[PDB]
Amino acid sequence: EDELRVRHLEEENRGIVVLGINRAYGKNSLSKNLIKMLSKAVDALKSDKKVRTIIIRSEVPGIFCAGADLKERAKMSSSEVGPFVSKIRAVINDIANLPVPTIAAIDGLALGGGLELALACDIRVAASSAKMGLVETKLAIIPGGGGTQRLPRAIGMSLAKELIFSARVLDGKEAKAVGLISHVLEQNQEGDAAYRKALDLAREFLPQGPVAMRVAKLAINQGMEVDLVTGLAIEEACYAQTIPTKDRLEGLLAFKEKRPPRYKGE
Amino acid sequence: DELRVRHLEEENRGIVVLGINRAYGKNSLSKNLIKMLSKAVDALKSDKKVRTIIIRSEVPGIFCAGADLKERAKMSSSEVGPFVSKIRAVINDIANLPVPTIAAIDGLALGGGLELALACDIRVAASSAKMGLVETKLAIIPGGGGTQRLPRAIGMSLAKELIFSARVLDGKEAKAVGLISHVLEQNQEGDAAYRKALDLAREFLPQGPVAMRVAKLAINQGMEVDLVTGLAIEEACYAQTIPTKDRLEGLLAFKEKRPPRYKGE
Amino acid sequence: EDELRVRHLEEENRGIVVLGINRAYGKNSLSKNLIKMLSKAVDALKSDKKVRTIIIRSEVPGIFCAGADLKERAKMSSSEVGPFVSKIRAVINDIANLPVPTIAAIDGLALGGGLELALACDIRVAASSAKMGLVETKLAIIPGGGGTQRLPRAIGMSLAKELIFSARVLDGKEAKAVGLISHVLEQNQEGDAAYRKALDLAREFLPQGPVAMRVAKLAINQGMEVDLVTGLAIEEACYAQTIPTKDRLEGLLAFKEKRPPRYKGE
Amino acid sequence: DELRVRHLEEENRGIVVLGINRAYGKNSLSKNLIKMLSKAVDALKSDKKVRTIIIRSEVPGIFCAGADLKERAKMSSSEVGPFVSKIRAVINDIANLPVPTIAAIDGLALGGGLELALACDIRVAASSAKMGLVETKLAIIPGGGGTQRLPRAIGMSLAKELIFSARVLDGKEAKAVGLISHVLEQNQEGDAAYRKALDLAREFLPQGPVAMRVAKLAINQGMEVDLVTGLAIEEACYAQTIPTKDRLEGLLAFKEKRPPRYKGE
Amino acid sequence: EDELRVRHLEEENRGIVVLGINRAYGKNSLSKNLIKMLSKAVDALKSDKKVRTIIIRSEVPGIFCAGADLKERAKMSSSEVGPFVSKIRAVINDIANLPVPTIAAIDGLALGGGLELALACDIRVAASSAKMGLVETKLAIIPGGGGTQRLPRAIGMSLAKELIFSARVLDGKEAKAVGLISHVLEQNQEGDAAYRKALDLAREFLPQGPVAMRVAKLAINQGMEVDLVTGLAIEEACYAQTIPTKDRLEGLLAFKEKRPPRYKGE
Amino acid sequence: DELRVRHLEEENRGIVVLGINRAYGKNSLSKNLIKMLSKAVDALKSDKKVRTIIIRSEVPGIFCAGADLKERAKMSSSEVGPFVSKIRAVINDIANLPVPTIAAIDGLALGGGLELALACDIRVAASSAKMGLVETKLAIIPGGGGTQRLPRAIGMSLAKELIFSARVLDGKEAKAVGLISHVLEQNQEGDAAYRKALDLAREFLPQGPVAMRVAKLAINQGMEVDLVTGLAIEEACYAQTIPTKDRLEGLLAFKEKRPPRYKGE
């Protein structure tokens, strides 16, 4: 439906695919269709084995994603609200589980599902003028896209609570100071400084073992949600997966022959 | 009495202040203060109008110096364990208070005192405030949840060092390690943190009471289990806001470009 | 052997035992023998009852521990790498479980197992010029010394992922900003500034009650890996252990007589 | 035609049956049956009327022999991992269906077939039905969630023995070790388990739909976390039934001494 | 008043404390008042020092507890229900946490709260003709006294689901068969068959060391709800508490002098 | 000399037996016996050829009575705990052995004895054999993992009663409460369980050793975390058997209608 565009970058960006929300008419809000195309796209990248890094961004300057579409919501019966929100929550959770490194490039507004979707990404970067927050309580509801879970895990319980309790919106610098994002940027002429940084950062990921990068992501993600000892067991099992791989050997041979490894993800 | 409870009014209505007032014992956690604090906390649990609670001291220069040492000296070994557990219990009840909580540290917060603050959702302290857990200097350990909440709030490393060294920090340092959310210059009235607390509390009053309560649950409960279960807890908590009158007011208020009128239902 | 030295300091520093890696010829890499010696050293202190605090450092300037010895690994078959690496993960985890406070003095390079060895310590102190990181992904593998579990817990999932995905190395300054270390300082002409500071901090731990210090480490370490309610029960059971000790009485007396306590560790 | 999804009527109205019909190849979890199955299970997650789901086979003697060995030999190791995970995935969705699920074992249930059965809430089998996880005899392990659900259903010890030995049990034995709740003697038609599963589902139909679904959520989620968190999950689940019309109907019906008639809301 | 009575058995039962429910006109239902009285009694006993075992039973023949009072519920605005139910769930959990061993003597009907209270006890004993179950789904609600939690734990998930789903009611015999109870016996001419058996069982616990018995309960209850490794640490910290006890040496001494132990709870 | 490590052969090739020979002490866990047990179990972890381990007593009528009371009464406060932790640490190492473990209870198994058995994957015991955890009668509590393994093995309620009453059971009773998986009648040789253990152990020899190892891993680890993470571990483990030569052999043997020839790798 054009609102979502999945691009597979070429040349020096080979290995990086991009997901760009494009829906100005609705401030990139999460409409019933946008999460289907989104869900559709995500399920596809799951299996896509040639991908090495996924960037999520907006093609509408000044806006990343305003969250759920309040308009469509007012037309939903109480017995329909829950199911729809849960759908939002699940598509975002699917994003948090994408096989490869993920980067959310915030160049504009990002509220509710907008920020929540970015919270599902591994790393977040934003212009200093970008605005983001979870303002659900002001509407007598709560973040329904995992924000009640990922925000506290990302910036700490106390700060996440203050933000949700006050439904306060932060700008790039504030977000960076609280830890919400790793890199804060200075918006440029075309309003894509964040996306730009994301591209650069992603390139730093391309030269590594595709198989290593994935199990490493698994070890980190799964292990953080269980006791450390079990977490250690998970690392061992992820590491085991890198042993019978060619890249493991192509890497040891790359340094012998003093040259950039030619990993294949094998 | 040694514990004051007051429901603020007007532009502060919806804020309940728990004020410790035992200048005599430096606000130490005595058997009585603990008994009263417990009643206070359980009552508030049921209160339907409270939208935020502030825990502060009504004695300048002191927040709470932890457990009363004069009493401990008169306790038999078979009494100590149960007593400290009674303390750990109340602190945890305070940690589970329904509405948002804010500790206003304008004085010395040691052991039980600091642990009480750690049980609150947010902490604000004056620059000159001194806080810390120095139990190891006494051959014991934090028994009010400190060994648990401290590492959770500032991280294992920083929390361990503080416990191992039994180091006391000031407001500036606590802000640096993330022990508190807001630090500020103590005013001449000796209630800087308290004032700031009030300004921050007011920022909570406008939100849907139901939403605020289950939002706290989703957070407090979600953090202590795996993310997937947390997401389920989030769904269950959201579910409760859907069939509320406030959720509609929220949408309507938006549609009529006006401030919402939430009633907690 | 001179490979791993164990210094039981005394008088003024009594209670402090230091572990110094001394494999200058191999950048202090975690060789087969070093592991075996390190393991024995740990297990030894694991029960030593005099100890009050352990410090892990290098006696080779500019180098802390380069991590796994890339050389021995070269002479390993795929059916052996796993077991070996798991052996490392086990010793490093043994270090994490030492009964007393542990400090890692970093006055030089800390990569892979080396940085992981430090993460297993309670406190990390380094010189702003010291470099550290987990570069496994560049070689097509992942941190096998517990790094996938300890790096996200110490500096947060997002940054931890960025450092591992990009295989970036940091200096003390950056490590301080990311929260990787708790103390950073300028290197001295002796190249042992971290050690100096580490030793100073260990001294602050000496006056405290020994039994109380150990159960406090158990409570914190253990409670951090289960729901908070259980941690509270764990705190309770750890505290109960200080109740009938002589030290606790000595503590209340010292306070009464307004004097310094004489803790015997019982 | 390979996958029949029927919405029964009459006294069984509210029961949805999913029958695997591929005698062609002993109902093996092939690339196709999987896609169709996933489509089916997904569809059911949103099925507003269903009150209980029964999974059975329409090929006498065979339930589901598990992963398609024929296909497995055609895929490179680079394709194995994914497909096996796809299985584990669809079976996991079956485990989280909103309503009560019943697996009727009237035939051979091996590997994925038995793992599919463990994803259901309740299992019933004919005494002559053979079931098991024999993965080890093929140098692999159960990849349909078997290593997790079997230990959970029958306990560690027994589950390990069954998996270490790759031993196949019969209805009676399966019933002996707890692998199933209901065993009965097979019949001429070869559908005794299915028939029993129907009479079990009918017992479920009369209860309030909402409470039933949230009851399942509370049970499934609470079991995978500490008891305390689980009690909070319970509370949040219970809360969702308070504001329902069915809840008042229940009390209304009790007052009038009549059977309640729940509509979901 | 006497709607709940606490008896401190003496003679050969000294140490045993019977908690009986005497509220016949409401089938020992959990009303505001009984819940309150019950909570105080429970709280009190929680700090009682001479208790060795607590037995919970009904003073009314043919009835244990029919759960919440439908009467009060009918007269209860929705915003009042959630709070009142959590209060039953909380008290039942305090019961689950009592210091010493607890036994539920089911001599009559045990429905909802009643059965849930019984599940909060460590051991359940019931007359063969006793009726027990959770029928909440028949009322469009779910168990709210812990049932969705304690039933699956006690008898397994599959069996727990089927009982809840069909809202089936079992008898003493059928309860023993599914593991809902540990001991089942034919009723007597007094109607206190389960109680008499519970007394005989309670007596078996008396000769043991009070402290050990307690920390043992802590270790079992707490370690069960967390990973085993952490569970093993909780056992360590609980064992530790028996080491400095005088009773520990009594057991040893009593053994040497080949004679019965005389423990005094310290 | 008091602990016999023996690698059987011919028909039993692959099985190794841990023999506790120490009648001059009822096989009590002495600081020295533990020493050896730890070193033997530490080496078995690296043994490539081992496919199954069997812990047995070479002393008839006695399996293991636990820690040696005598040495204990010669230990000061400070030594007890450290020592008991050594028992718990080894028994735990045992529980973590890479391959299947079968405990042959042909005689009295108490305290550390039963706890040593609880650490094995499967427990086989004579009908006359006696086993229990009687620590509470000694004013202490199970210190080899019993407060944890027993409750997970036979249920919380039963485990509580066995530990609270500190009663002893006989093979028959152990069977009905799930404490053991197999019960026999003791023979003239006084080694009934052992024999069963071997027969049972023979059923394991053929399966893929790699699959076997990662199967125990998945089961042991998944049972202690949430189900969802449990499935992840299973995937990660299934992953390890994919690139092996054994898996291919499995598909080949089947194809060529012949028994599988597995050999790790």
Curated annotation (Swiss-Prot), chains A, C, E:
EC number: 4.2.1.18, 4.2.1.56
Reactions mediated catalytically: (3S)-3-hydroxy-3-methylglutaryl-CoA = 3-methyl-(2E)-glutaconyl-CoA + H2O; (3S)-citramalyl-CoA = itaconyl-CoA + H2O; 3-hydroxyisovaleryl-CoA = 3-methylbut-2-enoyl-CoA + H2O; (S)-3-hydroxyglutaryl-CoA = (2E)-glutaconyl-CoA + H2O
Residues carrying N6-succinyllysine: 27, 36, 40, 71, 75, 87, 131, 138, 256
Annotated region described as RNA-binding, given as residue ranges: 32-46
Pathway connected to this protein: Amino-acid degradation; L-leucine degradation; (S)-3-hydroxy-3-methylglutaryl-CoA from 3-isovaleryl-CoA: step 3/3
GO molecular function: enoyl-CoA hydratase activity; itaconyl-CoA hydratase activity; methylglutaconyl-CoA hydratase activity; mRNA 3'-UTR binding
Top-level class of the enzyme under EC nomenclature: lyase
Compartments reported by the entry: Mitochondrion
CC per GO annotation: mitochondrial matrix; mitochondrion
PTM annotation (N6-acetyllysine): residues: 27, 40, 71, 131, 138
Known function: Catalyzes the fifth step in the leucine degradation pathway, the reversible hydration of 3-methylglutaconyl-CoA (3-MG-CoA) to 3-hydroxy-3-methylglutaryl-CoA (HMG-CoA). Can catalyze the reverse reaction but at a much lower rate in vitro. HMG-CoA is then quickly degraded by another enzyme (such as HMG-CoA lyase) to give acetyl-CoA and acetoacetate.
Homology family: Belongs to the enoyl-CoA hydratase/isomerase family.
Subunit structure: Homohexamer.
Disease affiliated with this protein: 3-methylglutaconic aciduria 1: An inborn error of leucine metabolism. It leads to an autosomal recessive syndrome with variable clinical phenotype, ranging from delayed speech development to severe psychomotor retardation, coma, failure to thrive, metabolic acidosis and dystonia.
Protein name: Methylglutaconyl-CoA hydratase, mitochondrial
Organism of derivation: Homo sapiens
Lineage, uppermost ranks: Eukaryota, Metazoa, Chordata, Craniata, Vertebrata
